[PDB]
Amino acid sequence: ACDYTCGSACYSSSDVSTAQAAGYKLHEDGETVGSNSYPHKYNNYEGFDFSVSSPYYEWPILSSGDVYSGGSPGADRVVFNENNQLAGVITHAGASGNNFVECT
Ligand SMILES: Nc1nc2c(ncn2[C@@H]2O[C@H](CO)[C@@H](O)[C@H]2OP(=O)(O)O)c(=O)[nH]1
């Protein structure tokens, strides 16, 4: 059930897969939504040890279960690459500044 824990947000594999599919599709069509223009390149400044190759893209995953459509993105993100492989699930919760910590 709780495959990914972001602070207090709990996401299942299906939740991630659904959000990732939506984000990858917009990337594929070259579209973006929200004040921060998601999905956009994630440079991995935090230096996370991803098992998949770059480039990476961040896309918001909502605790409500809805697919992001340009509103408030919240603190959690799913990270994917050009192969639509899941690099990881990250969050701003528990981090300082605009930094991310990996969800466990
Ligand atoms: N913290 C962080 N921000 C990133 C990274 N890659 C791109 N960014 C963007 O770099 C700027 C400083 O963090 C922000 O615009 C941020 O976008 P988001 O705010 O949409 O994450 C990354 O690897 N880590």
Q: Whose CA is nearest to atom 13 of ligand 1?
A: 98
Residue 27 among the catalytic residues: no
Q: Say if residue 104 is exposed, middle or buried (CB neighbours under 10 Å; 0-12, 13-18, 19+).
A: exposed
Helix (H, G, I), strand (E, B) or coil at 29: helix
Answer whether 95's CB lies under 8 Å from 101's CB: yes
Which residues are near ligand 1 (CB < 6 Å)? 36, 42-46, 58, 98-100
Domain positions in the chain are: 1-104
Helix (H, G, I), strand (E, B) or coil at 64: coil
Answer whether 36's CB lies under 8 Å from 23's CB: no
Q: What is the Å distance from ligand 1's center to 44 Cα? A: 8
Q: Which CATH number is correct for 1-104, 3.40.718.10, 3.40.50.300, 3.10.450.30, 3.10.105.10?
A: 3.10.450.30
What's the resolution in A? Answer: 2.0
- The closest-lying atom of ligand 1 relative to the alpha carbon of residue 38 is 20
Buried b (16+ CB within 10 A) or exposed e, 40-52: eebebeeeeebee
By what method was this entry solved? Answer: X-ray
